[PDB]
């Protein structure tokens, strides 16, 4: 009519206004120009700036959209809501309150009320993440390999020596170990400060579909109660 005879820039503005779902799904099917447009850098680049996103854009956009911690219940606010392969060495796991029963309060976030404490033997819990079921498709995982980023916090008691361990995996479809990060066992700091361990996964290769989170801990001393290491606030990200 008049429409498709109206200078590119405005057509963007209009287009800018729609749900990316629909730009990708529908608009790209209307006509050539439209499609060759949805596949504009400028079109997304705008929708981005349009809503802050800036620190292939389309992706970056959609990632910026999806981006959120993927670990369900990082702190024990629902006990062991949705953790699993939970092995309870000794007196098991236990959710206590900040600050530690003799052991310092949190800092670089304070919506953190709680944390798990471990016994006189190993305590491990785990999580598996369905990347697709979180909204991350194969053509992006295998082509883009955006950075997966694993964080975990842990600390000691001042009164007794403890030990931490982490082991994250990226997995093929049929549970194939596509990449590992393991820490081994580590000496939790004497004075019970809060330590924060991260990994970032990159150029990992194509086929990742799942991320497995697993960490654990216990005490060096070996006493009933919960003198073993304390974990919390564990989180997992796919960073645009």
């Amino acid at each position: 009519e008049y429409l498709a005879e109206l200078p590119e820039p405005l057509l963007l503005r209009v287009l800018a206004e729609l749900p990316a779902t629909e730009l990708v799904q529908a608009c790209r099917l209307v006509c050539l120009r439209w499609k060759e447009l949805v596949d504009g850098a400028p079109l997304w680049l705008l929708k981005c700036q349009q809503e802050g996103l800036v620190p292939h854009w389309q992706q970056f956009y959609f990632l910026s959209k999806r981006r959120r911690n993927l670990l369900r219940n990082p702190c024990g606010e629902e006990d062991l809501e949705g953790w699993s392969d939970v092995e309870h060495g000794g007196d098991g796991w236990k959710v206590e309150e900040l600050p530690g029963d003799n052991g310092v309060e949190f800092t670089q976030d304070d919506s953190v009320k709680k944390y798990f404490a471990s016994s006189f033997e190993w305590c491990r819990k785990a999580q598996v993440i369905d990347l697709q079921a979180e909204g991350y498709w194969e053509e992006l995982l295998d082509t883009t390999q955006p950075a997966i980023v694993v964080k975990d916090w842990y600390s000691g008691r001042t009164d007794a020596g403890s030990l931490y361990e982490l082991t994250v995996r990226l997995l093929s479809e049929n549970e194939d170990v596509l990449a590992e990060f393991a820490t081994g066992q580590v000496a939790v700091p004497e004075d019970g400060s809060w330590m924060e361990i991260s990994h970032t996964f990159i150029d990992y290769g194509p086929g990742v579909r799942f991320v497995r989170f697993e960490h654990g801990g216990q005490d060096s001393v070996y006493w009933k109660g919960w003198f073993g290491a304390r974990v919390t606030n564990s989180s997992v990200w796919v960073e645009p």
Partner: protein, 130 residues
């Protein structure tokens, strides 16, 4: 305060500067005698200057505007063109959504229908999931 503004087809319009000046591009023009606008016919121009009078101040889009823009395709664009040109940073937006509102939640066949745009497409039509 009254500025004379001339449409493409001869017609001349008096608006209070108060409610013009809402076009940035005209406002800036003022600091820095009809002003000619040989790229809006006065059917639009009219409509524009109404929008301005009603907004002498300042999704969803205000009801009144909703209503205002309840117009034939053609005339839409012609606003969403003038508006841009006149930098009526305000009207353009609400116009633009209106249109997008139209595109929203339709099928290619459908949008193509309601916009009377022709199916360009050979082949298949690359289908990927999200």
């Amino acid at each position: 305060p009254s500025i004379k503004l001339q449409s493409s087809d001869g017609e001349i319009f008096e608006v209070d500067v108060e409610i013009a000046k809402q076009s940035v591009t005209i406002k800036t023009m003022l600091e820095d005698d009809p002003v000619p606008l040989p790229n809006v016919n006065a059917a639009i121009l009219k409509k524009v200057i109404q929008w301005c009078t009603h907004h002498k101040d300042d999704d969803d889009i205000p009801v009144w505007d909703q209503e205002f823009l309840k117009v034939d395709q053609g005339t839409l664009f012609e606003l969403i063109l003038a508006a841009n040109y006149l930098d009526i940073k305000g009207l353009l937006d609400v116009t633009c959504k209106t249109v997008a509102n139209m595109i929203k939640g339709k099928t290619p066949e459908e949008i193509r229908k309601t916009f009377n745009i022709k199916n360009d497409f050979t082949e298949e039509e690359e289908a990927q999931v999200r």
